[PDB]
Amino acid sequence: MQDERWNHPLYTTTAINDEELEGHAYIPGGLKVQTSSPMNDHPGTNPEQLLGLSLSTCLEATLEAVEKEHGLPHTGAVRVKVAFIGARAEYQFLVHAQVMVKGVDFDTAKAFTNEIENRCPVSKLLKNSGNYTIETVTDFK
Amino acid sequence: QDERWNHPLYTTTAINDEELEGHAYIPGGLKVQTSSPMNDHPGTNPEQLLGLSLSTCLEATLEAVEKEHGLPHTGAVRVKVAFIGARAEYQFLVHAQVMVKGVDFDTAKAFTNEIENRCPVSKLLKNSGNYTIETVTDFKD
């Protein structure tokens, strides 16, 4: 509104949560997920998981675009770990992404990781958080 | 070596190892179909997943704040996410809207301020320059 970057986006969506901790979150017209506290064993997802799903997907999409700009097939994969830390009124999330590119030498995988770190929208939102790290790996084993 | 990773409350991991028309998953947990937001194919996307994460986190934080004030849980949170930009210049914008049906607007605003400061996903986004939050009385428009 004040921020005129909202005036004509490429795409917009919305998400709602209007339930108790043991509840659901949903995209109106779209995906609904069961949610629950990460501190119990009940079925359901949580913000930590949902954030990891968001970032891993965004990084992977960005990596696919980079691969294509280099004339390469898609052989990349991303794993994101999210940690919940702290105490009442002092809670934080930590986020650590791992990027692999199976098709290529490690130096190329590292270069692509640097490229995607700079381009991925979710990565950019977390850049200044103090809580986000990213690395290149050869596998997730 | 960030020591905050040493003994967390909870950790999880998310993977995306597929094409844009693919899936993301939590090992042993939720798997979601994904797709580009720029087509009409089935599947979620990073924008949606981020909205689900933040709306859920804000709502959970709000539930704690309501309880601290001895009020029932009447809150609801909607998060809008926009995709803007161009090749190698893409960003997301995030706008949270918080309602607390059981209380007057000044109280709803006060609670919104409290959750903005406590919600882990909100804190991650604080320094992004792309995240705003407001108090509302409904989700019109």
TrEMBL record, chain A:
It comes from the Bacteria. Pfam families: OsmC (PF02566). One of its GO terms (biological process) is response to oxidative stress. InterPro entries: KH_dom-like_a/b (IPR015946), OHR (IPR019953), OsmC/Ohr_fam (IPR003718), OsmC/Ohrsf (IPR036102). Belongs to the OsmC/Ohr family. This is Predicted redox protein, regulator of disulfide bond formation. It comes from Lacticaseibacillus paracasei (strain ATCC 334 / BCRC 17002 / CCUG 31169 / CIP 107868 / KCTC 3260 / NRRL B-441). The lineage of its organism: Bacteria, Bacillati, Bacillota, Bacilli, Lactobacillales.
